[PDB]
Amino acid sequence: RTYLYRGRILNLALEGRYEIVEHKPAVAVIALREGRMLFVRQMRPAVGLAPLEIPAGLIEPGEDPLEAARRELAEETGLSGDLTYLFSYFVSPGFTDEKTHVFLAENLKEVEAAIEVVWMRPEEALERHQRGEVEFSATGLVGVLYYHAFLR
Amino acid sequence: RTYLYRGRILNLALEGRYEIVEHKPAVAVIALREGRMLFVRQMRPAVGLAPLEIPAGLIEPGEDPLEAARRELAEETGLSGDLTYLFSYFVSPGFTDEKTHVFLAENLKEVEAAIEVVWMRPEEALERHQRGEVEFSATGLVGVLYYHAFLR
Ligand SMILES: O=C[C@H](O)[C@H](O)[C@H](O)COP(=O)(O)O
Ligand SMILES: O=C[C@H](O)[C@H](O)[C@H](O)COP(=O)(O)O
Ligand SMILES: [Zn+2]
Ligand SMILES: [Zn+2]
Ligand SMILES: [Zn+2]
Ligand SMILES: [Zn+2]
């Protein structure tokens, strides 16, 4: 494990063959309300566009998944609710170790009044994408599929 | 966009603030057969473990998503089938531009006889994970949720 770079949100290392990008673990929050899912959008310079996503972020030091989940929901949408741990996944285990912890939010309450809050019915997000009008981050897609799988 | 590294499967660059890992687009194949989903496992040095995944890989030069999908299914499981484009997503648009194209495979036929082929019912993969016995890559999770959403 030889490091070629130690950055702000990632490190670039080598393990002989493998190029490994170490990355901080992250969280994602799935929230449904009156048939609409809470998506969000922000400019993403890494991809040149603003894909459809759900409240998410990096787990800060001394903070655990749940806590991180709570903070992200509040900082990105100004809402708080009852969170339940659903599952987790490695974004791309082929080169990075970024692991995302997904949560479900219920009984959302306005606790606060350029990260666009986008309430939208999962069915329409799915249609817009199939029509090529909008893109998906892993979180957005997982939010939609999860919904179609367990929240209808 | 200043490059700090140009590697084999990724490039590390800077856009003033942003640390950007350019990555080749990838494909993923969802296949169900007699209630079992076709998962796969391989050692992943980037994460130190072998998460539950579905046939996937990098799109080679001159190859399009579908073609890549076909090749991966065949090289990793020795099967071929009827593939349909489902949707796509950016693994982690926060730092990388890796985009994955997900396909569904049907009417799988053995076209060929350390990437472990793991046939397993999505319900059990889901239970094992909830029990903390197994991890998920984004592809594996998407495969499971997609199944629970549209293939039951
Ligand atoms: O998460 C997997 C990504 O596709 C990585 O880029 C990984 O290195 C790809 O490896 P492979 O082609 O063996 O699936
Ligand atoms: O795909 C998003 C990943 O979490 C990236 O690491 C991204 O840089 C995180 O940014 P933020 O905390 O603003 O969501
Ligand atoms: Zn954030
Ligand atoms: Zn931070
Ligand atoms: Zn491959
Ligand atoms: Zn290759």
Domain CATH number, residue B34: 3.90.79.10
Amino acid (1-letter code) at residue B58: L
Residue B48 burial (C-beta neighbours within 10 Å; 0-12, 13-18, 19+): exposed
State how far the Cα of A47 lies from the Cα of B97, in Å rounded to an integer: 5
- Whether residue A12 contacts residue A5, with contact meaning beta carbons closer than 8 Å, is answered with yes
State how far the Cα of A100 lies from the Cα of A146, in Å rounded to an integer: 15
The secondary structure of chain A in percent helix, strand, coil, rounded to multiples of 5, reads 25, 45, 30
**Tokens 């990632």 sit on residue:** A10
Residue A101 tokens read as 């912890």
Q: Please answer yes or no on whether B138 and A91 come within 8 Å at the CB atom.
A: yes
DSSP-assigned letters across all residues of A73-92: HHHHHSEEEEEEEEEEEES-
- Whether residue A140 contacts residue A54, with contact meaning beta carbons closer than 8 Å, is answered with yes
Tell me which residue in A9, A18, A46 faces B46 most closely, judged by beta carbons: A18
Give whole-number Cα distances, A57 to A93, A98, B40, B144, in Å. Answer: 18, 11, 28, 24
The strand pair at A10-15 and A18-23 is best described as antiparallel
Ligand 4 center to B50 CA (angstroms): 28
**Tokens 């490695």 sit on residue:** A90
Residue A4 tokens read as 């070629």
What b/e string do you get for B69-92 counting C-beta neighbours within 10 Å, with b at 16 or more?
bbbbbeebbebbbebeebbbbbbb
Strands (E), A34-78: 36-41, 56-58
Number of separate domains in chain B: 1
Q: Please answer yes or no on whether A135 and B89 come within 8 Å at the CB atom.
A: yes
- Whether residue B147 contacts residue B29, with contact meaning beta carbons closer than 8 Å, is answered with no
State how far the Cα of A68 lies from the Cα of A105, in Å rounded to an integer: 13
Q: Which residue is closest to B86 within chain A, CA to CA? A: A130
Amino acid (1-letter code) at residue A119: W
Give whole-number Cα distances, B120 to A7, B32, B82, in Å. Answer: 39, 9, 20
Residue A34 tokens read as 């009156």
Find the domain containing B13 and state its range. 1-152
Q: Does A97 touch chain B (CB under 8 A)?
A: yes
State how far the Cα of A118 lies from the Cα of B111, in Å rounded to an integer: 45
